[PDB]
Amino acid sequence: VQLVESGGGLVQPGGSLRLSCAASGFNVYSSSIHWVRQAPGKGLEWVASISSYYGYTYYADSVKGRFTISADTSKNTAYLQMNSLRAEDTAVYYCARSRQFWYSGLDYWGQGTLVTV
Amino acid sequence: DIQMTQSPSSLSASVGDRVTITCRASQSVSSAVAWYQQKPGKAPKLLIYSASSLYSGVPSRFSGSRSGTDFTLTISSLQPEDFATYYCQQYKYVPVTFGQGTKVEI
Amino acid sequence: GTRVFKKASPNGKLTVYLGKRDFVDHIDLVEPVDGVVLVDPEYLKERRVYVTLTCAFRYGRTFRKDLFVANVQSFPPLTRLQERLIKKLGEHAYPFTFEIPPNLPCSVTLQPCGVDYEVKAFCAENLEEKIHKRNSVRLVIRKVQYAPERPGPQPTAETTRQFLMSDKPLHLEASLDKEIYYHGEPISVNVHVTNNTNKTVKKIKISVRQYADICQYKCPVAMEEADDTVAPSSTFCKVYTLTPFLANNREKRGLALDGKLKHEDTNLASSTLLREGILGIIVSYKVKVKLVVSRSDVAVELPFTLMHPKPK
Amino acid sequence: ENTVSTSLG
């Protein structure tokens, strides 16, 4: 049981970037996949979360309208289509997983990827 | 939206000392509170959930306590591996909110 | 610490307590609803305080037939929950221990109807005295089942269809990895066709169907489809994967879902365990493996149990 | 009306 992420890089502001979250040992329908971002020197912040089981996608207002969260059903992998990036969106971006039945804290996190604008 | 003012942001503690972290919310969120640990550079890991229950494999010195809206994480004896930054989390409402973090130092 | 539920009537004249709202059914027994009612006597000069438990089959047609009703009088007339609530309230609190009998149906919410439990409490001077919204306090509670603690047999099943126009039949076997599946976990169908006929296997259709017996209602909740053909005088073996979930099942009006207190999102209704070897809603699931033929049918069905784990 | 939670003392 483990999560691993990648896809961060230098990005031209106004461009786009995709983060990906690979899952081993579990499934997207029995669990909820979360994104938590950590700007350098600052604390954590929830970005978005998807519960593929129900059809619910959740977002924070600090990234609403730009970031899109989705999951690849056939390969348990989550995505984050980051459109229209801006300076403060620089952070270490982690994938998070928590129980669907029933959410009891984020237990499995990957080491994530550093995204810089 | 629930603010989750957390204090103190940093504290000094020797090995075998007692450490308590207070996370105060702008509303009652039932007992829906989680605590996470983060060594510098590493991914966060859950310690306590439902504000009192301890996650599988988490050491016995980690504990949770609630008094109305003053959810608290209590570390019984600070071991050298515990030095990290700790994050409180309500998860009763969307948008989900994290605390500002509490780091520990020697 | 621990927490308990409270509720009151608009008059603010009556107060009720429960320590849980999901009461588990162990098939061999059902738990009691052990709560404490706090009274204000003076305003209760009627002097008969009643507590009531009820199992309403408020199914659509619309109608209502109360499958089970229980009554108890608290004032004028103990578990640890009772004792601690009584001690907390000091003196003027009186208990109420219903015992749901075995064989009554589980908390079920048909997708918008169903079966739900209703703790109702009030004060009066006779049972025949009219019920009025100014005085009654009500709590909708649930009675549910967790998955069994011990695994059963592997749900293997088989068939063989000696087509009259052929000398040798289409032998077939379907098996699941396990008969128990928790909510959110994947199903694994092992299709092991061994064909010896002149007919060609065109179309393998795999589906998980809900059998809601309400005292039979059938609907496919998970569906897989593949062109994994099997050639004449050839064998085949594939492990298909499926998982039932609610996202694509919203539009299916009527599907049984886990009982809900007010309107919260709940998973597809966990299978009901029958007593040993029944009114209300009985629900079970089976995996159906169907193979089209051409030279146009065969099928075998697999009972499996879809139920939650016991909480930690 | 509504349902609240309270301690057990």
Please describe the topology of this protein.
The complex is a heterotetramer of chains A (117), B (106), C (312) and D (9).
Chain A lengths: L1 E5 L9 E9 L6 E8 L5 E8 L4 E4 L7 E6 L4 E7 L7 E9 L8 E2 L3 E3 L2
Antiparallel strand pairs in A: 1-2, 2-7, 3-4, 3-8, 4-5, 6-7, 8-9, 8-10
Chain B lengths: L5 E2 L2 E3 L6 E6 L8 E6 L6 E5 L3 E2 L7 E4 L4 E6 L9 E6 L6 E2 L3 E4 L1
Parallel strand pairs in B: 2-11
Antiparallel strand pairs in B: 1-3, 3-8, 4-5, 4-9, 5-6, 7-8, 9-10, 9-11
Chain D lengths: L3 E3 L3
PDB class: signaling protein/immune system
Keywords: GPCR, Arrestin, signaling protein, SIGNALING PROTEIN-IMMUNE SYSTEM complex
Assembly: tetrameric
CATH class of the largest domain in chain C: Mainly Beta
SS content category of chain A: mainly beta
Rg of chain C computed from alpha carbons, rounded to a whole number of angstroms: 26 Å
Strand content bin of chain A: over 45%
**Name given to the CATH architecture of chain A:** Sandwich
CATH-defined superfamily of chain A? Immunoglobulins
CATH topology of the largest domain in chain C: Immunoglobulin-like
Beta content of chain C comes to over 45%
**End-to-end span of chain C in angstroms?**
18 Å
The Rg value of chain A, from CA coordinates, equals 13 Å
**Number of structural units classed as domains of chain C:** 2
GO molecular function (chain C): acetylcholine receptor binding; AP-2 adaptor complex binding; clathrin binding; clathrin heavy chain binding; G protein-coupled receptor binding; inositol hexakisphosphate binding; molecular adaptor activity; phosphatidylinositol-3,4,5-trisphosphate binding
Region (Interaction with CHRM2) (chain C): 41-74
Subcellular location (chain C): Cytoplasm; Nucleus; Cell membrane; Membrane, Clathrin-coated pit
Protein name (chain C): Beta-arrestin-1
Tell me what you see in this structure.
The complex is a heterotetramer of chains A (117), B (106), C (312) and D (9). Chain B is an all-beta fold and 106 residues long. Helices cover 0% and strands 43% of the residues of chain B. Chain B has a single domain (4-104), classed as Sandwich (Immunoglobulin-like). In chain B, strands 2, 4, 5, 6, 9, 10 and 11 form a seven-stranded mixed beta sheet that branches. Chain B has a four-stranded antiparallel beta sheet with strand order 1-3-8-7, with no helix packed on it. In chain B, β4 (33-38) and β5 form a beta hairpin. Chain C is mainly β and 312 residues long. Chain C has two domains: 5-144, Immunoglobulin-like, CATH 2.60.40.840; 157-306, Immunoglobulin-like, CATH 2.60.40.640. Chain C has one helix at 80-89, and strands at 4-8, 14-18, 22-24, 32-39, 48-57, 65-75, 93-99, 108-110, 114-124, 137-144, 157-161, 170-176, 180-181, 187-191, 194-195, 200-214, 217-226, 238-242, 256-258, 281-294, 299-306. In chain C, a hairpin with a 4-residue loop joins β20 (281-294) and β21. Chain D is mainly beta. Chain D has one strand at 4-6. Chains in contact: A-B, A-C, B-C, C-D. The interface between A and B is medium-sized, with 21 and 25 residues. β1 of chain C pairs antiparallel with β1 (4-6) of chain D. It is classed as signaling protein/immune system. The entry lists the keywords GPCR, SIGNALING PROTEIN-IMMUNE SYSTEM complex.
